[PDB]
Amino acid sequence: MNTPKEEFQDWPIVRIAAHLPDLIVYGHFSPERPFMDYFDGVLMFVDISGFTAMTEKFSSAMYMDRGAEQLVEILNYHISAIVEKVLIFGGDILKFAGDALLALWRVERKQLKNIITVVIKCSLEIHGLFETQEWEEGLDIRVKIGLAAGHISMLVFGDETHSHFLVIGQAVDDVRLAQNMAQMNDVILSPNCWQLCDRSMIEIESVPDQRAVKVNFLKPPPNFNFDEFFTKCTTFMHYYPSGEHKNLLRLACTLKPDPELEMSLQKYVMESILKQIDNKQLQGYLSELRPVTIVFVNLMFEDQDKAEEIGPAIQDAYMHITSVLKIFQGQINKVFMFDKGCSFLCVFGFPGEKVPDELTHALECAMDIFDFCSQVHKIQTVSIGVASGIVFCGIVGHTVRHEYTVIGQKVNLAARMMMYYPGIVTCDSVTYNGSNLPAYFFKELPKKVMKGVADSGPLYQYWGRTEK
């Protein structure tokens, strides 16, 4: 008999798995919401703000009507190469945002030392991709890498139809802190990472007024062979593609249909993405430069360093946020958590869900969320930034590992507003002027110099309907 080869690998469940890390795809969790788990690992945070700051050049008349299509293509060309490096070095890409990606090497405590060496090597090869790279006089095509290691907590929250996850705790805080100390082409180790690493492998230098360190060189011992060392390390990597599947970037490419598993995985993915995965919408429909309103919610916790406390609080906030967003087809695009603020990137006017009075509604929703979350047990401070304008939307990453992402000056502004004006609902000039609302509903704010924002315009507090 004949033996036709090639297993079919293009099932809906595989296409869904592209939008999720192995932490979720291979997770098998209890139904309780919230769900918490605890483990150890090495984290890599790759600052990609250098080439995602491109959103400005692609809004120009020079791109004719194809700014969004050109932007997604060039971003994915560069980001795909970073993803391949992380995946071949055995990492799990957790999440993408406009300005970063976060990757995880989950391992037993005894193996943290050797895995740090692997992740340092990966980081240096990432930098190597961008050595002679630019556009239109501008080698702003470089990255900044922060590494951390130690205890990691995972939180899964949601309802019967939607799920979200976060990694939290000190190593998570550390990796953000490490990456914001980095200059272009740097690899910064968190203080705990430096304490746990194989110091014989690396030459470091001090970071002024910091216990975190900069990797100058990976200079291994005389008898060292990285390839043999990496093969030993794969003993500890549960899902490293191997044997018959050594040619694949992810074991998740081999997932077979399983309705119970697919029911669980689909809850993490937006319905319009599922429509495209089901071949019920054109594959290019979601790449667009689209007017939206960003509602960026930040929740700060009473006891920030307690996972068992913050998980229920985030679940409670989430149940309210989701009910409020449903009323106006608002969507949670991302949830992120670092300086023990949990932040929800909410979007009004995504593709196929654009309501007319987007501005008035975004403000009313912001105030509703603000009032409710302010009364949630263990939530110390709620802060909400509201900004409106043209943003890039699209699926960003590699064919085998990608996520729908929103990128733009208005996303960065709403993020900055919630941090620089804590404890209140703020909005930009577009929102204020557009809203069908009387001027005494607002308070014109002092101008603050905010990181990455230049010419923010006048900013306002949404005070609400009454003096109170």
Ligand X SMILES: COc1cccc(C(=O)c2nonc2N)c1
Name the binding residues for ATP. 47-52, 99, 144, 406, 412-416
Q: Is 102 in the site for ligand X (CB under 6 A)?
A: yes
Residue 201 in contact with residue 117, Cβ under 8 Å? yes
Does residue 94 belong to the site contacting ligand X (CB under 6 A)? yes
Find all residues with CB under 8 Å of 446, minimum gap 6, and list them: none
User: Does 82 engage in binding with ligand X (CB under 6 A)?
Assistant: no
| Interface segment toward ligand X; rule CB under 6 A; list 75-83, 95-103, 132-140, 387-395 | 95-103
Q: Which stretch binds ligand X (CB under 6 A): 28-36, 91-99, 246-254, 295-303?
A: 91-99
Question: 271: helix, coil or strand?
Answer: helix
Nearest to 185 by CA among 133, 241, 142, 247: 142
- State both tokens at 298: 């930040």
Residue 437 · residue 360 · CB < 8 Å:
yes
Q: Are 122 and 5 in contact (CB under 8 A)?
A: no
Whichever of 99 and 364 has its CB closer to ligand X, that residue is: 99
Residue 415 or 430: which CB sits closer to ligand X? 415
336 binds ligand X per the rule CB under 6 A:
yes
From 13, 116, 149, 167, residue interacting with ligand X (rule: CB under 6 A) = 167
Selected from 19, 78, 85, 95, the binder of ligand X by CB under 6 A is 95
Question: Nearest approach, Cβ of 154 to ligand X (angstroms)?
Answer: 8
Nearer to ligand X, 152 or 367 (CB): 152
* CB contact burial 383-395 (16+ within 10 A = b; e otherwise): bbbbbbbbbbbbb
Binding of residue 100 to ligand X (CB under 6 A)? yes
Cβ closest to ligand X, residue 48 vs residue 141: 48
List 97, 188, 202, 365, residue binding ligand X (CB under 6 A): 97
Applying CB under 6 A, the span of 165-173, 302-310, 371-379, 420-428 interacting with ligand X comes to 165-173
Tokens of 409: 């000056």
CB 391 → ligand X: shortest distance, Å?
15
The answer to whether 166 contacts ligand X (rule: CB under 6 A) is yes
Q: Rule CB under 6 A: say whether 152 interacts with ligand X.
A: no
75 binds ligand X, rule: CB under 6 A = no
Distances (CA, A) of 137 to 74, 141, 290: 16, 11, 28
Closer CB to ligand X, residue 58 or residue 338? 338
Residue 45 or 230 having the CB closest to ligand X: 45
Position among 24, 68, 101, 265 found at the interface with ligand X (CB under 6 A): 101
Does the footprint of ligand X cover residue 407 (CB under 6 A)? no
Buried b (16+ CB within 10 A) or exposed e, 303-337: eeeebeebbbbbbbbbebbbebbeebbbbbbbbbb
Please report, as residue ranges, which positions from 172 to 201 form the binding site for ligand X (by CB under 6 A): 172
Angle of the 307-327 helix axis to the 358-373 helix axis, nearest 10: 150
Length of the chain: 468
- Specify binding-site residues: 47-52, 95, 99, 144, 167, 176, 337, 406, 412-416
Alpha-carbon dihedral angle through residues 306, 195, 144, 455, given to the nearest 10 degrees:
50
| In the complex, minimum distance from the CB of residue 166 to ligand X, in angstroms, rounded to a whole number | 4
CA dist 301 and 288 (Å) reads 36
Helical (H) or strand (E) element with 401: strand 401-407
Contact 133, 139 (CB under 8 A): yes
Task: Quote the least distance from Cβ 236 to ligand X, whole Å.
Answer: 22
Chain residues that interact with ligand X, rule: CB under 6 A: 94-95, 97, 99-102, 166-167, 172, 336-338
